[PDB]
């Protein structure tokens, strides 16, 4: 007869800059995409791994990060939808959360992309293990 509601704050984001010189393959942008916690918080306490599903046109498109930083750097020629799966150190439903991230690129002659997307997860009545893992962040 008592309730719990844990709330964690995640930050998804990405930067994208037009290359001074495009690569031999025609890639014209350097971009990086990241998942992190605010103000250098340590989300590893409850995040097992983070999976970046790149477009099929990329070699080894399913990138995995088991340790911080949860980022992917790459060079490319067009934007796309990047599914990001965040897996928690949870043994109960739900193990991970999915985010469809709009990784867009701006044209040359425009200021580079520095995009931020704040997300906020609320877990209700979790297990005590997951609870203390979540609350150590």
């Amino acid at each position: 007869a008592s309730s719990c509601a844990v709330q964690v704050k995640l930050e998804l984001g990405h930067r994208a800059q037009v290359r001074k010189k495009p690569t031999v393959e025609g890639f014209t942008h350097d971009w990086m995409v990241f998942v992190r916690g605010p103000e250098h918080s340590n989300i590893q306490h409850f995040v097992e791994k983070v999976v970046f599903h790149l477009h099929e046109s990329f070699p080894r498109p399913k990138r995995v990060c088991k340790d911080p930083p949860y980022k992917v750097e790459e060079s490319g020629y067009a934007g796309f939808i990047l599914p990001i799966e965040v897996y928690f150190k949870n043994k109960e439903e739900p193990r991970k959360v999915r985010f469809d991230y709009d990784l867009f690129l701006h044209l040359e002659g425009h200021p580079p992309v520095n995009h931020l997307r704040c997300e906020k997860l609320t877990f209700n009545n979790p297990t005590e293990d997951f609870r203390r893992k979540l609350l150590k962040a």
């Binding site: 942008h29 477009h55 067009a78 796309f80 867009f104 690129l105």
Partner: peptide, 4 residues
């Protein structure tokens, strides 16, 4: 840029 263009969407892929």
């Amino acid at each position: 840029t263009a969407x892929x």
